[PDB]
């Protein structure tokens, strides 16, 4: 491993507005992106809210349906956008990327970003 995940320490969005949680990296030769995960904190663990694999994007909860968009045009930009922020969206979010190397083995890396919601 690996390409470096660039993220902010915190992000602040507006209640019922939209926010974009930055997770971007420069693609590297020898690291093929095979999985992207966004997770949220729940108690003493994290829970997957979004998965992107070979069959596309999967929001793992109806509450997020239509609310979650992960960037998919500029390579290495897998930033999370949340539509119409709820106060309950205040949380620690995690961006998690899996790269596959020429070995066929896989390198997982992740980053935690705090989301604050105002108004």
């Amino acid at each position, epitope marked *: *491993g690996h390409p*470096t995940l660039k*993220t902010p*320490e*915190s992000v602040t969005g507006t209640w019922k507005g939209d926010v974009k949680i930055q997770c971007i990296y420069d693609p590297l030769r020898g690291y093929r992106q095979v999985l992207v995960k966004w*997770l949220v904190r729940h108690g*003493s*663990d*994290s829970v997957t809210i979004f998965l992107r694999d070979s069959t596309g994007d999967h929001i793992q909860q109806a509450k997020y349906r239509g609310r979650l968009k992960v960037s998919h045009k500029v390579p290495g930009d897998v930033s999370l956008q949340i539509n119409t922020l709820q106060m309950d969206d205040r949380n*620690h979010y*995690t961006c*998690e990327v899996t790269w596959q190397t020429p070995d066929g083995n896989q390198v*997982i*890396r*992740d*980053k*935690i*970003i*705090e989301l604050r919601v105002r108004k």
Partner: nanobody
Amino acid sequence: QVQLVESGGGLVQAGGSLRLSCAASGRTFSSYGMGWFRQAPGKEREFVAAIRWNGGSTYYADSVKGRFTISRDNAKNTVYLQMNSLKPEDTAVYYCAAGRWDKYGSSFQDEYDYWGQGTQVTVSS
């Protein structure tokens, strides 16, 4: 942001035990995985142990598996390294580190943004 201060290093007999502490300033502690690294004379810095933000999920280097534990006081924003059955080859400067990894990469130096001064631990034969 995080400023890290180690403490508790010193002299210790072989077979002995020693607990290192590391105070982390800042108010975003819960975003950071914490880790201990060490660097011996004439050798490159290596991973010792790490602990997730939750304060219970831990990771160890094979060289200290079974001997060392890592713990974390999330309220005091502190982490500790309990060492046991110390050998001369554990002699090194030990570093407290913090990074915003969640579950993964805790064994790699490049995943930590913030580093303490390091504290000296010497294990006499």
